């Protein structure tokens, strides 16, 4: 299923609504009206850049700046 229901009342109660602008109650936007989240999954390979040795990814022995 693709979308989520809603209650419409069609009045010129604010002026705000014209040329397709619309107002949404702030509470029923806190109560969970169609909250979203996106998964972007970047990808990396260290074989992309040709370097010497057995470069693979790991935190070095060297003390990394302890942040």
């Amino acid at each position: 299923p693709i979308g989520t229901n809603a209650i419409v009342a069609v009045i010129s109660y604010t002026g705000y609504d014209m040329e397709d602008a619309m107002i949404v109650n702030k509470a029923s936007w806190e109560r969970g009206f169609a909250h979203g989240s996106v998964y972007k999954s970047e990808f990396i390979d260290l074989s992309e850049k040709i370097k010497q040795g057995d470069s693979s990814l790991v935190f070095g022995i060297k003390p990394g700046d302890p942040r």
Binding site: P1, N5, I7, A27, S28, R31, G32, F33
Partner: protein
Amino acid sequence: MIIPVRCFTCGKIVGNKWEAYLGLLQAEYTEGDALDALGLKRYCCRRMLLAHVDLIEKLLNYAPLE
């Protein structure tokens, strides 16, 4: 996904009627009567059950079960 806690329009607690909903289902009421007996009057709370569709009893099958 899972049933939301408080209704959207007004604010009632609806995050519990689901189990008793399926209950009064097995007792074979026509849903109009079920949402009545569950005590919901203003319709903006009824369309929260008359049209919910559960997506964890169909999404858990891919569980990394053990």
